[PDB]
């Protein structure tokens, strides 16, 4: 209150939980661009993009740790149910190789004919 008649002190009540954490906004880098309902690794966060980001703009990634259906798997490898999934940021595809890829999930439904996997997203470590 500007120009208040009396110097009223203000006391801030602390708070920690800022949101639910289901999704996070992220700023696109130069050589990046995202379309809706596809997985990306943007600033260390792996999740499903909920908006079409073009360049240097803000997009939201879903990190809900839920069960997700996804194409974009390296079809050479066979993804049995229960195997750990990894994200190949160079190829922008899922893989079971743990050389230096980011661990992102575990398979529920095995690799079917359509190269479709059902997997449980992981806590973004």
């Amino acid at each position: 209150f500007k120009g208040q008649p009396t110097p009223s002190t203000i006391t801030q009540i602390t708070r920690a939980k800022i949101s639910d954490g289901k999704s996070v906004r992220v700023i696109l880098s130069e050589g990046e661009s995202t379309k809706t309902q596809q997985f990306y690794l943007i600033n260390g966060f792996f999740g499903v993009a909920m908006q079409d980001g073009e360049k240097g703009d803000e997009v939201t990634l879903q990190i809900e740790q839920a069960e997700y259906e996804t194409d974009n798997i390296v079809t050479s490898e066979a993804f049995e149910a229960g195997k750990l999934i990894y994200w190949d940021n160079t190829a922008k595809k899922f893989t079971t190789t743990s050389a230096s890829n980011r661990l992102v999930g575990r398979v529920t439904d095995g690799k079917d004919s359509n190269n479709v996997i059902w997997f449980i997203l992981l806590p973004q470590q």
Partner: protein, 43 residues
């Protein structure tokens, strides 16, 4: 006998608070004259 002895016992003394009129100023919509409203629930 001194009031200073019983000053700390606030529950004995009458509690009076002076009105200050503190709060947050109302925020009016100043943009109304400039804009033409298009209210439609299916845009």
């Amino acid at each position: 006998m001194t009031f200073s002895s019983t000053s700390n016992l606030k529950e004995l003394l009458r509690k009076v608070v002076l009105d200050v009129e503190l709060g947050r100023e109302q925020v009016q919509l100043l943009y109304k004259p400039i804009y033409d409203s298009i209210a439609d629930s299916n845009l």
